[PDB]
Amino acid sequence: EPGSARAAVSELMQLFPRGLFEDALPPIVLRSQVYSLVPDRTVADRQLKELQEQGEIRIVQLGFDLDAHGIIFTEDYRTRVLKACDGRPYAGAVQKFLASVLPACGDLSFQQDQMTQTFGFRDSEITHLVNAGVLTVRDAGSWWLAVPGAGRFIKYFVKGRQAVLSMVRKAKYRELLLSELLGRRAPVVVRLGLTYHVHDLIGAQLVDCISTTSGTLLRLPET
Amino acid sequence: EPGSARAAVSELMQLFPRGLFEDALPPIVLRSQVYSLVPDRTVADRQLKELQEQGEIRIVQLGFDLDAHGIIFTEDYRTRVLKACDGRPYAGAVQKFLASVLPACGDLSFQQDQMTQTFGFRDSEITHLVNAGVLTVRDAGSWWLAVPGAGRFIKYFVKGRQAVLSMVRKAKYRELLLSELLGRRAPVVVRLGLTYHVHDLIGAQLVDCISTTSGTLLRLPET
Ligand SMILES: [Cl-]
Ligand SMILES: [Cl-]
């Protein structure tokens, strides 16, 4: 048990092809993928919550079907977002946000009253954070923590998830051995990698992970 | 601006009276209502297309007009479709639909050749989906994705929309102050609520909003 989520996150982070994205973008793993490696969701959730509380990771709302939470290392996010904002007009607002707000508040989102009254942000500074892509509107009174450049990641991720699921759907009886899937040529549209995508499919229960005497069989869950 | 359509959907979702259908139906909001909260239709349409592609929402065609799009959370669709299916003979067909079709694309409709060849459905399984209310006929060769029990929603919605327009039409010179309309108690025929309906009328441009020294005046369009 101890270190299960931490080990899973580091294993999944190593799969991330960071060279595809904006310099601002830290490697992202999905809570769904952690569940592939730590299938006890109670354990996975408790240890991710501990890492969140101990400052080490940020949870980000990305809004996918099934598990829509991204996981990033806080220090990776901060380093890249700071470098990226250097000598842009939103740099001052972003520096204050990273230095004051992130350590004070571990939530996925921030309230307007919190930002303006507790932290002393001007509306124009909040607008800068939205322009920088560090905040996105959640509702009339709050903003999601966001990752600059995540739009490209979300686009690549959704197209790749559908393409990998299609590999299983196209196979005889809508099932495919893991070794057969991973040994296939990655379609052009799968930019984040087959293994990266398979962990998401297993954790999101878009495929069933069946133990056979031929190894792991991925099966569409039609029953 | 980023997240505007998603934030509008979350705000409108809170207006839905779930207790009206005993949570047999997933909460439904309308693209017209999103236009009330996101009046740049170009931005609203671009962001709704992104959310559709990402799969946290499903867009559903509703037949009362060309561009009547319903908006539901995919997890609410799955939860309600599964509750509705529980111990019914179309359960097998519906499970295959949710596992194979739903995650493949955000499409509003499916061609016959798509259903049989891509998704492996037998006609008997398609008949089950029509009986379940998960598909409705679009034309001789295709089906709309549909929400089980949406018939009752459509009936309440059409009668409510016309009842609220009738309140304005019956008023002197076919215009009524917004505060006066909202300060009415909803006649039994307006089952989805006045505010829910007023956002649809504003967004769909079925009323014109006129600025006056008495507040916003709703005026019926005389073309
Ligand atoms: Cl790389
Ligand atoms: Cl209103």
Q: Which fold is adopted by the domain A4-75?
A: Arc Repressor Mutant, subunit A (1.10.10)
Judged by phi (left if over 0) then psi (alpha if -120 to 50, else beta), residue B80 lies in alpha
Domain map (residue ranges) of chain A: 4-75, 86-148, 151-219
Instruction: Write the CB contacts of A171 (distance below 8 Å, at least 6 apart in sequence).
Output: A180
Distance A20 CA to ligand 1 centre (A): 7
Q: Which fold is adopted by the domain A86-148?
A: Arc Repressor Mutant, subunit A (1.10.10)
Q: Which of B100, B103, B118 sits opposite A222 (nearest CB)?
A: B100
Q: Nearest to residue A153, comparing CAs of A167, A133, A171?
A: A133
Whether A31 and A48 have beta carbons less than 8 Å apart is answered as yes
Residue ranges of A 186-215 with Cβ closer than 8 A to chain B: 206
Task: Please tell me the experimental approach by which this structure was elucidated.
Answer: X-ray
Whether A145 and A61 have beta carbons less than 8 Å apart is answered as yes
Q: To 10 degrees, the CA torsion angle through B39, B40, B43, B45?
A: 60
Q: Which fold is adopted by the domain B151-219?
A: Arc Repressor Mutant, subunit A (1.10.10)
The ligand with the least distance to the CA atom of B181 is 2
Q: Looking at CA atoms only, how far is residue A207 from chain B in angstroms?
A: 8
d(CA A78, CA A94): 10
Determine the angle formed by the axes of helices B194-203 and B150-170, rounding to 10 degrees: 80
Resolution in A: 1.6
Distance A17 CA to ligand 1 centre (A): 4
The answer to whether B175 contacts chain A (CB < 8 Å) is no
Q: Nearest to residue A200, comparing CAs of A153, A146, A149?
A: A153
The answer to whether B120 contacts chain A (CB < 8 Å) is yes
Please name the CATH architecture into which domain B89-148 falls: Orthogonal Bundle (1.10)
d(CA A42, CA A33): 15
Burial of B79-92, coded b for 16+ CB within 10 Å and e otherwise, reads ebbeebbeeeebbe
Distance B216 CA to ligand 2 centre (A): 10
Which residues are near ligand 2, the ion (C-beta closer than 5 Å)?
B 198
Q: Do domains B89-148 and B151-219 have the same CATH topology?
A: yes
Read off φ and ψ for residue A45, nearest 5 degrees: -65, -45
